[PDB]
Amino acid sequence: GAMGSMERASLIQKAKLAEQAERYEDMAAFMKGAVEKGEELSCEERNLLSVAYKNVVGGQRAAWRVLSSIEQKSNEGPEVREYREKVETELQGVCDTVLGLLDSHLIKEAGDAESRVFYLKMKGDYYRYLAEVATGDDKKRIIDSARSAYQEAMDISKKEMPPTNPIRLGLALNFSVFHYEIANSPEEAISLAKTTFDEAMADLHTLSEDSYKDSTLIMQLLRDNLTLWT
Amino acid sequence: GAMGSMERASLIQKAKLAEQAERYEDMAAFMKGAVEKGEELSCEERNLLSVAYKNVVGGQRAAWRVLSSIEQKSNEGPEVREYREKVETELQGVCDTVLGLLDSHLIKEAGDAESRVFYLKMKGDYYRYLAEVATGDDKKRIIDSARSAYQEAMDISKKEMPPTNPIRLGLALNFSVFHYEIANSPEEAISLAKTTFDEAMADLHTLSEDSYKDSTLIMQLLRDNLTLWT
Amino acid sequence: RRFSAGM
Amino acid sequence: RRFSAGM
Ligand SMILES: N=C(N)c1cc(-c2ccccc2)c(CNC(=O)c2cccc3c2OCC3)s1
Ligand SMILES: N=C(N)c1cc(-c2ccccc2)c(CNC(=O)c2cccc3c2OCC3)s1
Ligand SMILES: [Cl-]
Ligand SMILES: [Cl-]
Secondary structure: OOOOOOOHHHHHHHHHHHHHOOOHHHHHHHHHHHHHOOOOOOHHHHHHHHHHHHHHHHHHHHHHHHHHHHHHHOOOOOHHHHHHHHHHHHHHHHHHHHHHHHHHHHOOOOOOHHHHHHHHHHHHHHHHHHHHHOOOOOHHHHHHHHHHHHHHHHHHHHHHOOOOOHHHHHHHHHHHHHHHHHOOOHHHHHHHHHHHHHHHHOOHHHOOHHHHHHHHHHHHHHHHHHHHHO | OOOOOOOHHHHHHHHHHHHHOOOHHHHHHHHHHHHHOOOOOOHHHHHHHHHHHHHHHHHHHHHHHHHHHHHHHOOOOOHHHHHHHHHHHHHHHHHHHHHHHHHHHHOOOOOOHHHHHHHHHHHHHHHHHHHHHOOOOOHHHHHHHHHHHHHHHHHHHHHHOOOOOHHHHHHHHHHHHHHHHHOOOHHHHHHHHHHHHHHHHOOHHHOOHHHHHHHHHHHHHHHHHHHHHO | OOOOOOO | OOOOOOO
């Protein structure tokens, strides 16, 4: 790896700098290097990993959707399809890289609920991004891989975390989006969002002012989706 | 070049797609490939080239300024300097690529005023970006190279273009920014912006409604700079 | 557009 | 921040 000669601490420091500079491809490369040092990641480090790849894949997904729409309109030369394929291939490569980091070896070394749920949610997320562009023989298996990762994360989070935990809430939010637009299960999506919102509501009284702000921020995303979906 | 096997027309088509997808590094790579086909560029094609590299170098410059500020504060480990240097080197490479396209062989083949002024302005612009980060033995020569390109463009534009021409106006705007913040000549900057604005004003009566909108848009940038500078 | 956690 | 043409 091109980051093999840099100290772990310097990679983390430079990831934080790259975030401030909005250099998210650099940020992701630095955090990939940090993961490849082989040590477990702290809470803050896990968030840096997540933010970096979310921004990288988010730009690719937004581009793919623009190109796919143009391509669709043009089917109502080969250049549109070719360029959509180029972006799609690059996106799949990013998802494969993230999934490879989780499988080698973040998940197997993650014993605490906060770390294991975080990584299993990420695994579901990046299989979901693969499913957004999937069309061939393996699409159903891609979908089931996302479902399986989300489900294991949900099972742990329900046993080990309070209903206001922000990781638990963000997991439920994304699993509900999975149901709605990947699995064609809008009723499951709505039920999960509502149950998650209501159980978090009833737990807010246990929280500090800061935790309350953290949880209600994500609850608002659940509510906004319910308003869009109902 | 990695774009050597693609048709010129397909490269231009994909540059337009990449713009719609906000994939500006791709856009620049496609337009570099189009230039390297060896034919002159049309007005529209010149704009695609300009937009692509403006967005690429603009992200790098914005990142460099964030990092340089952090570095300065830290001088009131080596990681901040190292990462600023990395971004700076990448930025210089982009400027060198653009300047190489202009020198091989866009400028020498540009005979019309609109194309020659466009390219000489671009040459000034990318030497100016080099000057923004320059500190060593060659900084004065970098500054003079920007000045020389801007000056030749100004001389042609004054002889061959009306004072409301948008290329002429954008050239004068950028040469005025060069004076203000690169050449430490704020009075020259203010004088150029004011004279450019006033001579354009007096020519607006010759324009169509569409041209009037084009010219007054850039005049407003001249005015806003004068308000900031006075 | 619906929200996911990262957005 | 001052304007240049590209912005
Ligand atoms: N560099 C970054 N972008 C971050 C660094 C740290 C960090 C973590 C631990 C210690 C120090 C810093 C982050 C922590 N989580 C969030 O911001 C966040 C996002 C969504 C929901 C919630 C969140 O907080 C709890 C609720 S994000
Ligand atoms: N793809 C793009 N981003 C563009 C394609 C074309 C184009 C050119 C010729 C024919 C067809 C399209 C562009 C033309 N110029 C501008 O927009 C512009 C920018 C600044 C000032 C002015 C401008 O217009 C005159 C005044 S920009
Ligand atoms: Cl392509
Ligand atoms: Cl670096």
